[PDB]
């Protein structure tokens, strides 16, 4: 369970290549003498497949992923490879598929099996009367919540270790699409020593298991034969591939057996076969695909670092008003860049409420107002959503959904006089509460008791507009703070100023995606020789084709050049004559992609010969190709 085998030799996971492995039957449709294509999880030709061992010097049990599709090719001569382990993370946290073979039946159970660190099989008591009977079963630990159980036909498998070369080949195809498990199997006698053959074979399905679970990691089970860490294995090999959603050609005979497969993405010789949907291709030049240059960078330019709102003059002014008769400043037609206010290092009291400050820059609000006033330092907490006091209920009431900020700084040497500053006033008493964002400049005499005031003072008649008290020799927190309240509001009106334009630097002279303030698309920004107008934005062609752009505040005229595109024509010989092909793209050059430049494109794969011969394969512009010794 937790004890691992100490007979493991360290080896790096080297890779190898296959020739035509990974082709199976995609469906159960019987066809005769046709060549049709299909799109499924296939193993592409000349792929980097793994190179593992199943011997006693190097005994390794690696874990490979499963979500990308794998191909399982394994050679066997002494019945060492028995089954496999399927699961999500190789644990008993969920249901897992386990298909084992104890030489009697094919046990396929879907339970919550407790997988160990290194599960393996072993045969014990090889002294007298061995008979190759298994005794140690260390595959799983427990079983709970089973949903499927299948028992195959009983048989007898000889577990005797055979000597010599390989005798059997067991190649499997494992895939999982939307929980529907599919298993392909193939068995054929072979004669191998170390590696996989360079041949072709097809696979047939055996059973269908509609389980409905996801498999991400898997591990191959191996058996050992020892004559708990001194177990020795036999002699076997197994390769793990990687499936890709490719398209192959299926050459059907009169019996429906695939004899050869053609990849449409391996070599340009085989790409011509997928166009004509046949194996025998005559001498000539045919189109295979289309060339296209993918963009690698998005282009977003700026208009200028100017046209900013005066945050250094509004939020740093000298003359302000009172808390009840404050001056409301209108903010419109600017760029609300808050980069100079967050790291200004000049505000002793800087706090924001409501939401995150990163969300305020990515979300645009409608009403952006500034409420600046000078108050004392005892009731600064009352400027907050959900507060009570002489400011939030008598001077300046804030709504509960306040997402603004509070900006203040030390002004002990600016708004403080010796003897008391009586320039600003504040409301003390009121008959009731206020409204959110409400101005009250009334001079009504408050009546505390039952005695009427009649506009003048008297018994229980105090003046509500009292004066502030400022002192330079007062406390360090009771200094007058020039609090500038920034109001935020989101309504059905269109938003005006919340810093809309956020971009960066731009590149040019590449196949990129330009995105300006008035034109977007895809094109190469090359040099131009035209003459533009200072109020224009871009230019178009006759038949509605954008082919020119202009910088906002830079004297630079650029055109919209299309990238390298066009069809892919491959010159291919006959199937029984030669196999050398050339790469020829249309409407390109030999710089943006045996190299020669023609009028139709760049010809790569043909050596230029000054001798003029007979035109056998046409290319274009008086250039032809031939097959010389």
């Amino acid at each position: 369970q937790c004890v691992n085998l100490t007979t493991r030799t360290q080896l790096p996971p080297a890779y190898t290549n296959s020739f035509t492995r990974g082709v199976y039957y995609p469906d159960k449709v019987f066809r005769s003498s046709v060549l049709h294509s299909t799109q499924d999880l296939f193993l592409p030709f000349f792929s980097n497949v793994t190179w593992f061992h199943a011997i006693h010097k190097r005994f390794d049990n690696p874990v490979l992923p499963f979500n990308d599709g794998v191909y399982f090719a394994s050679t066997e001569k002494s019945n060492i490879i028995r089954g496999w382990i399927f699961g999500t993370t190789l644990d008993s946290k969920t249901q897992s598929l386990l298909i084992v073979n104890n030489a009697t039946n094919v046990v396929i159970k879907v339970c919550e099996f407790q997988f160990c660190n290194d599960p393996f099989l072993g045969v014990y008591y090889h002294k007298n009367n061995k008979s190759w009977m298994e005794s140690e079963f260390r595959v799983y630990s427990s079983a709970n919540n089973c949903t499927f159980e299948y028992v195959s036909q009983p048989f007898l498998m000889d577990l005797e270790g055979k000597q010599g070369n390989f005798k059997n080949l067991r190649e499997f195809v494992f895939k999982n699409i939307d929980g529907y498990f599919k298993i392909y199997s193939k068995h054929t006698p072979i004669n191998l020593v170390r590696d996989l053959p360079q041949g072709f074979s097809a696979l047939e399905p055996l059973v269908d298991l509609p389980i409905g679970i996801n498999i991400t990691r898997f591990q191959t089970l191996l058996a050992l034969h020892r004559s708990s860490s001194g177990w020795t294995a036999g002699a076997a090999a197994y390769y793990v591939g990687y499936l890709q959603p490719r398209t192959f050609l299926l050459k059907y005979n009169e019996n429906g057996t695939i004899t050869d497969a053609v990849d449409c993405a391996l070599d340009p010789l085989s790409e011509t076969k997928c166009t004509l949907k046949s194996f025998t291709v005559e001498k000539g030049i045919y189109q295979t695909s289309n060339f296209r240059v993918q963009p690698t960078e998005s282009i977003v330019r700026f208009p200028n670092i100017t046209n900013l709102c005066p945050f250094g003059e509004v939020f740093n002014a000298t003359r302000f008003a009172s808390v009840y008769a404050w001056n409301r400043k209108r903010i419109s037609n600017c760029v609300a860049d808050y980069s100079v206010l967050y790291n200004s290092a000049s505000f002793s009291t800087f706090k924001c409420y409501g939401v995150s400050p990163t969300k305020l820059n990515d979300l645009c609000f409608t009403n952006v107002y500034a409420d600046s006033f000078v108050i004392r330092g005892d009731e600064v907490r009352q400027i907050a959503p959900g507060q009570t006091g002489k400011i939030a209920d008598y001077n300046y009431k804030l709504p509960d959904d306040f997402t603004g900020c509070v900006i203040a700084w030390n002004s002990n040497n600016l708004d403080s006089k010796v003897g008391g500053n009586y320039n600003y006033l504040y409301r003390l008493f009121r008959k009731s509460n206020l409204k959110p964002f409400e101005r009250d400049i009334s001079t009504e005499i408050y009546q505390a008791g039952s005695t009427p005031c009649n506009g003048v003072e008297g018994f229980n008649c105090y003046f509500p507009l009292q004066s502030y008290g400022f002192q330079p020799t007062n406390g360090v927190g009771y200094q007058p703070y020039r609090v500038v309240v920034l109001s935020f509001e989101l309504l059905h009106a269109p938003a005006t100023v919340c810093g809309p334009k956020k971009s960066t630097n731009l590149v040019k002279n590449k196949c990129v995606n330009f995105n300006f303030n008035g034109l977007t698309g895809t094109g190469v920004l090359t040099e131009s020789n035209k003459k533009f107008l200072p109020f224009q934005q871009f230019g178009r062609d006759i038949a509605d084709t954008t082919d020119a752009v202009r910088d906002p505040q830079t004297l630079e005229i650029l055109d919209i050049t299309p990238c390298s595109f066009g069809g892919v024509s491959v010159i291919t010989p006959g199937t029984n004559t030669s196999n050398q092909v050339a790469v020829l793209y249309q409407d390109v050059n030999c710089t943006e992609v045996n190299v020669f430049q023609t009028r139709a494109g760049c010809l790569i794969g043909a050596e230029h010969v000054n001798n003029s011969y007979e035109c056998d394969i046409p290319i274009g512009a008086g250039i032809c190709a031939s097959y010389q010794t």
Epitope: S348, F350, V476, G477
Partner: antibody, heavy 118, light 108 residues
Framework: VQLQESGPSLVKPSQTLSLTCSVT????????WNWIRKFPGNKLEYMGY???????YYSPSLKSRISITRDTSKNQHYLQLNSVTSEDTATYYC?????????????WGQGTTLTVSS | DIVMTQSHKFMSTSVGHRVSITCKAS??????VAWYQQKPGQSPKLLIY???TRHTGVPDRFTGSGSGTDFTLTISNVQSEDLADYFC?????????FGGGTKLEIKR
């Protein structure tokens, strides 16, 4: 400048807390006086403050429960808590806040434990 | 109130290495970022005020920076006397809202 707490450690409910955190190292000339309790499990909560000039301002959560005074004669301060309950059992800390030479200074005490139980 | 949300509740470091405590505040406090220094068995003490000036008696091995919300206290050349619980808070106005808490562990 290091403060030191003093007083009883058992106060019955529906009574008045009477603690004393003295000041040693700096005379009462300019600064403030804070009082922050410490819940068991590394949790803090502000209670109130009072300036050295004679201005009182309390927290909006605990309006009539926080009553902190000052005494500039013996360089000591009193800590009173109105309407005590079982949830007020915490580690009380006394702190001060004063400025000087354009710098920010914040000193604390030593630590005391008060448990309210009937 | 200002909620000073932290990333981790306990961190460990060795003598001579560099440690960093990430405290992402949900509300904007600007450059007014304060830090504490709590010896075990004693009261906390002021360590870093206004995120750019150290306290009197503190060596220059404690640095700090940030922009908006991503505030990370950089502690280099950790010694045996650096055993303290660094707290992130704000000193804008009363009340002084404090954070959750991070306990530093010194390896030797």
């Amino acid at each position: 400048v290091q403060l030191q707490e003093s007083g009883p450690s058992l106060v019955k409910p529906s009574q008045t807390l009477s603690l004393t955190c003295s000041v040693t190292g700096d005379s009462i000339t300019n600064g403030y006086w804070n009082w922050i309790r410490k819940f068991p499990g590394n949790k803090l909560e502000y209670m109130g403050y009072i300036s050295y000039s004679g201005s009182t301002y309390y927290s909006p959560s605990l309006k009539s429960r926080i009553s902190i005074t000052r005494d500039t004669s013996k360089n000591q301060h009193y800590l009173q808590l109105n309407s005590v309950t079982s949830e007020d059992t915490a580690t009380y800390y006394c702190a001060s806040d004063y400025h000087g030479s354009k710098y920010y200074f914040d000193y604390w005490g030593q630590g005391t434990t008060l448990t309210v139980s009937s | 109130d200002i909620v000073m949300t932290q990333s981790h509740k306990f961190m460990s470091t060795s003598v001579g290495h560099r440690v960093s405590i990430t405290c992402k505040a949900s509300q904007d406090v600007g450059n007014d970022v304060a830090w504490y220094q709590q010896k075990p068995g004693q009261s906390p003490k002021l360590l870093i005020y206004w995120a750019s000036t150290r306290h009197t008696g503190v060596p220059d091995r404690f640095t700090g920076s940030g922009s908006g919300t991503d505030f990370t206290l950089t502690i280099s050349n950790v010694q045996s006397e650096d055993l303290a619980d660094y707290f992130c808070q704000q000193y804008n106005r009363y009340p002084y809202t404090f954070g959750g808490g991070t306990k530093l562990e010194i390896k030797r």
